[PDB]
Amino acid sequence: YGFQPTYGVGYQPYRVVVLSFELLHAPATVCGPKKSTNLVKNKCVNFNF
Amino acid sequence: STIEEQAKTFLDKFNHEAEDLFYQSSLASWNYNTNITEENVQNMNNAGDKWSAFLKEQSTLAQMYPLQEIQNLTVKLQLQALQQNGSSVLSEDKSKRLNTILNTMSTIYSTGKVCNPDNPQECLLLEPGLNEIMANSLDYNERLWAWESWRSEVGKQLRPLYEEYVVLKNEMARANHYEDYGDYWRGDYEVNGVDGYDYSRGQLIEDVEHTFEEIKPLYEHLHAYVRAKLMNAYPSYISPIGCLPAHLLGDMWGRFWTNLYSLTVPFGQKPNIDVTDAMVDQAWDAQRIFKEAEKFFVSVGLPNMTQGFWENSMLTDPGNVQKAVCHPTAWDLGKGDFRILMCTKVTMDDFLTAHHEMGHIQYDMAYAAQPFLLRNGANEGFHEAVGEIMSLSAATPKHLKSIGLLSPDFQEDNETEINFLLKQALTIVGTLPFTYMLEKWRWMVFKGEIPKDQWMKKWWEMKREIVGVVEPVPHDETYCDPASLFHVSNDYSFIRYYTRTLYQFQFQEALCQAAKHEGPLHKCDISNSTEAGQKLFNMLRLGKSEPWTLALENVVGAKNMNVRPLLNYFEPLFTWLKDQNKNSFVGWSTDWSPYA
């Protein structure tokens, strides 16, 4: 390349990352965060511990 | 092995290096001009000569390719552009002598010192000074004397150089499969591509003068009016049936009649249009001037300018010890980089010049779609036409009133419109015979149709015939007036200015017809015309890939070279001059002279 700050639009260096997701039959290890709510005591509620 | 397919890889590899090498050379040039210092000179010279010494091998290798089976028109055109050998065919002695004569005549033309005979210690140059003597003067002797000095102490030594320069150029043209060098300068005005769009060098030789005769009666009316004004100003000096002197034209060589407008003003009661007071009172600085002018392309339909050009390019106020060049230049440095190099001031003429240069920049960013070697116009008459279209549009008082730059209560009438039209036509069309005759003289001196002795006497005769300028003092062969001009001794093709003017009015009338405008062509305005923007941009991006014959098909109605719009533009002027010179004969004859 000949990248320079004086270069015009589209002539500047752009850093690009491509993320690919793969789900082979092996047990999963990568998953997004899970939101955890607050807990309340002494109240008839349904829970998902 | 096939060579048609292998040419693509070589062209791409060459272009990859050419892009950034030419970019670095252009940046070096911009640095040298912007910063006038010894440091920027060495980098300039290294960049320029390294770029040339890199392009030389690319030209050298571009000869094994058999340019006789390339079905790709763009590839064929690019290869033949790179197939050009330039002046690298002669022997070392002849080529080095050609370089020597180029350099020495370039130096000599810039070193013209002319001193007054009674005081030989005060010479003057083509710079302000001797030029200022004829710039605005009311006298007879101080003009003829300065003319004779400038064409005697500069017009006598340029002839021996120019003779051998001409013979060497003709020899090189013969060695380059050209009958004469006029074909070499007419190579740009040739396309031999698709059927119906074919054109030849020899066609222009005839086509130049066919379209010139339709404005000859108008030019004769203009000449009669100018002569009558001259007698009204310079009594007993110009024959009414004859013609006007050479030193009273208004310029160093009478190229234009801009300086003759004040002498030959039609009506001094109605002032010309000037809005510089509006800018100064409204505090329109250079940035405001450029920003307000930026909206015009958006109104026409062109996209907004790319960010970054502001920072890279300087606009105004070089200021302190850090000097800069004020020569108006629009740098297309490559890689999509554009820069501006003006010295902006608060002036209506500066407004028009900024419009012209930003139109040049718009054309530059428009034809950026073409590859590196096709990032150019089809001929030399397309860039200047586009540049001057917007200057003509901004010269319209209607746009001035619309942008609030003038009071909306204007009461314009036929008098001021006719005055402005005459001011325009004193230079727009008056110089066309001058350009035509100079180009014809250069053609016939490169064609070998005349001997060395018959160089200037014929030149003077047909100058009198076409324009009507005779010698204030008789001249012999030791003088050389044509070489005492800027675009004669630096190898400059002078036909660009002739065809660009014809393209300007063609494009303007095409825009006016595709602008839903009714009325005079001079009052036609393209502001807020989105329909003309697409019509212009359809060819602004075509570049050198497409033929100029095809280029004159997306805007103008027809590709024929006829002077239709010039007569329409000065139609009120034509009818105002028609009822002016009722008694004075229109035209001139080539048998009067001031000395006889």
The DSSP annotation for B296-309 comes to HHHHHTPPPPPTTH
What residue spans of B136-275 are helical by DSSP H?
141-152, 158-175, 181-185, 201-210, 216-233
Copy the structure tokens of residue B3.
């060579």
Q: Residues B129, B130, B131, CA angle at the centre, nearest 5°? A: 85
Number of residues that this document lists for chain B: 596
B511, B536 in Cβ contact below 8 A? yes
Pairing, β B337-341 against β B329-334 = antiparallel
Put simply, whether A10 touches B (Cβ < 8 Å) is: yes
Put simply, whether A11 touches B (Cβ < 8 Å) is: yes
Copy the structure tokens of residue A11.
């002539």
Tokens 């086509």 identify what position?
Answer: B207
User: What are B341's strand-pairing partners?
Assistant: B314, B329
Largest CA distance in chain A: 69
B34, B324 in Cβ contact below 8 A? yes
Contacts of B464 (CB under 8 A, 6+ apart): B243, B470, B588, B590
Q: In terms of C-beta density within 10 A (0-12 exposed, 13-18 middle, 19 or more buried), how is residue B207 classed? A: middle
Copy the structure tokens of residue B332.
């297309």
Q: Is B174 helix (H, G, I), strand (E, B) or coil?
A: helix
Of B322, B384, B367, the residue nearest B34 (C-alpha): B322
What is the C-alpha to C-alpha distance for residues B595 and B242, in angstroms, rounded to an integer? 13
**Do A8 and B337 lie within an 8 Å CB cutoff?**
yes
**Do A8 and B308 lie within an 8 Å CB cutoff?**
yes
Q: Residues B470, B472, B475, CA angle at the centre, nearest 5°? A: 85
H or E element at residue B341: strand B337-341
Copy the structure tokens of residue B245.
């002197």
Per DSSP, B331 falls in state E
Copy the structure tokens of residue B400.
């001035």
Of B459, B544, B555, the residue nearest B507 (C-alpha): B555
Contacts of B370 (CB under 8 A, 6+ apart): B376, B541, B542, B543, B544, B545
Of B285, B332, B353, B338, the residue nearest B307 (C-alpha): B338
Model resolution, angstroms: 2.8
B181, B170 in Cβ contact below 8 A? yes
B413, B572 in Cβ contact below 8 A? no
User: What are B339's strand-pairing partners?
Assistant: B331
Contacts of B552 (CB under 8 A, 6+ apart): B503, B506, B559
Comparing CB atoms, the residue among B27, B307, B335 nearest residue A11 is B335
Residues of chain B neighbouring A6 (CB-CB closer than 8 A): 27, 308, 312, 333, 337
Q: Is B521 helix (H, G, I), strand (E, B) or coil?
A: coil
Comparing CB atoms, the residue among B19, B20, B336 nearest residue A8 is B336
Distances (CA, A) of A39 to A34, A35, A49, B130, B491: 15, 13, 10, 97, 90
B155, B105 in Cβ contact below 8 A? no
H or E element at residue B339: strand B337-341
User: Which amino acid makes up residue B209?
Assistant: E
Of B211, B257, B220, B300, the residue nearest B503 (C-alpha): B211
What is the C-alpha to C-alpha distance for residues B91 and B273, in angstroms, rounded to an integer? 59
DSSP of B522-552: TT---TT-HHHHHHHHHHHTTTTTS-HHHHT
Q: Looking at B272-379, which runs of residues are DSSP E strands?
A: 329-334, 337-341
B455, B477 in Cβ contact below 8 A? yes
What is the C-alpha to C-alpha distance for residues B72 and B175, in angstroms, rounded to an integer? 29
Method for this entry: cryo-EM
User: Which amino acid makes up residue B58?
Assistant: Q
Contacts of B524 (CB under 8 A, 6+ apart): B396, B508, B511, B512, B515, B517
Radius of gyration (Cα) for chain A, nearest Å? 24
CA dihedral B564, B567, B572, B573 (to 10 degrees): 160
H or E element at residue B337: strand B337-341
Comparing CB atoms, the residue among A2, A4, A9 nearest residue B306 is A9
Which of B23, B305, B339, B372 is the mutation pick for testing A, counting most A CBs within 10 A?
A: B23
Distances (CA, A) of B507 to B196, B370, B544: 21, 22, 18
What is the C-alpha to C-alpha distance for residues B23 and A35, in angstroms, rounded to an integer? 54
What is the C-alpha to C-alpha distance for residues B243 and B499, in angstroms, rounded to an integer? 27
Residues of chain A neighbouring B31 (CB-CB closer than 8 A): none
Q: Is B123 helix (H, G, I), strand (E, B) or coil?
A: strand
H or E element at residue B384: helix B383-394
B572, B448 in Cβ contact below 8 A? no
Residue B303 backbone class (left: φ over 0; alpha: ψ -120 to 50; beta: rest): beta
- Report the 10 Å Cβ neighbour count for B490: 12
